[PDB]
Amino acid sequence: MAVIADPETAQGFRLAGLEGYGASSAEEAQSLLETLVERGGYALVAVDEALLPDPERAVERLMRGRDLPVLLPIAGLKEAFQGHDVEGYMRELVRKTIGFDIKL
């Protein structure tokens, strides 16, 4: 597997055995993710949401062709210390997945 996030957390991810990487910019994150996916290899790639909220949307040109890489929006660090709205994330996910954009 592997992960892309801020360098502050990538060190810990590697400390756990994941091929971590440091993302300095949203463009940098997208380029690195494209390089990671284009290269044949690891199966899971969690992407920091703050730098790229919708990795599948951005990498649409590849994931539509290959289905092994499992992208994943992972929570940011400074956000984690203050929390984030999971319910809103799931509402957006439902909108994306069934399109009918309604929940309660």
Partner: protein
């Protein structure tokens, strides 16, 4: 022959009659009586009778009736989602429309013919019940905007007051009506 409205007799009739009261067995299966479908029925007398209503019933009766019709249309426009997912998954406003449609149906469109008092209704009584329901709708919409829980709006005794309006005798409807309008006014202010 088999309900095909394209039959020549039906088509010739519909060229000459001013009202089409479409009965449907689907409603009667759902225990809804009279079994008249408000989506397929129509009338060509409403505009010519409006001046009569504005003097014999009330000046705003045409507007209230049009409002009831628009509410029913809004309900019919939300059956493509209520079918896919139950009423519970709809947001506050759409579920409010669904419940307003339910109350319209069950407390204004239904009428027991074997009941001692419900078998008959006057134009004043119908106008009163329409005004009841529409005023409740306005207040419930305002409350939802004020962040009230829709479930709380679905538990108010005022709804049970509106439900029994069908069975109140004509000599007793006016007092019931004024009291229930005042209770509607004072039922959402009480609810936070």
């Amino acid at each position: 022959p088999g309900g095909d409205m394209s039959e020549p007799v039906t088509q010739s009739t519909l060229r000459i009659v001013g009202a089409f009261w479409r009965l449907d067995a689907s409603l009667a299966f759902r225990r809804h009586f009279p079994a008249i479908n408000w989506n397929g029925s129509y009338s060509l007398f409403t505009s010519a009778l409006d001046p009569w209503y504005r003097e014999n019933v009330a000046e705003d009766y045409p507007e209230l009736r049009d409002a009831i019709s628009e509410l029913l249309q809004r309900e019919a426009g939300l059956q493509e989602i209520v079918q896919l997912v139950g009423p519970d998954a709809l947001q506050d406003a759409e579920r409010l429309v669904i419940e307003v449609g339910r109350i319209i149906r069950e407390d204004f469109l239904q009428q027991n013919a074997y009941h001692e008092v419900d078998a008959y209704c006057s134009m004043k009584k119908a106008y009163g019940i329409m005004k009841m329901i529409l005023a409740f709708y306005k207040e419930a919409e305002a409350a939802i905007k004020r962040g009230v829980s829709i479930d709380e709006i679905l538990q108010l005794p005022v709804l049970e007051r509106i439900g029994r309006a069908r069975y109140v005798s004509e000599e007793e409807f006016p007092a019931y009506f004024e009291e229930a309008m005042k209770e509607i006014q004072g039922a959402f202010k009480a609810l936070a």
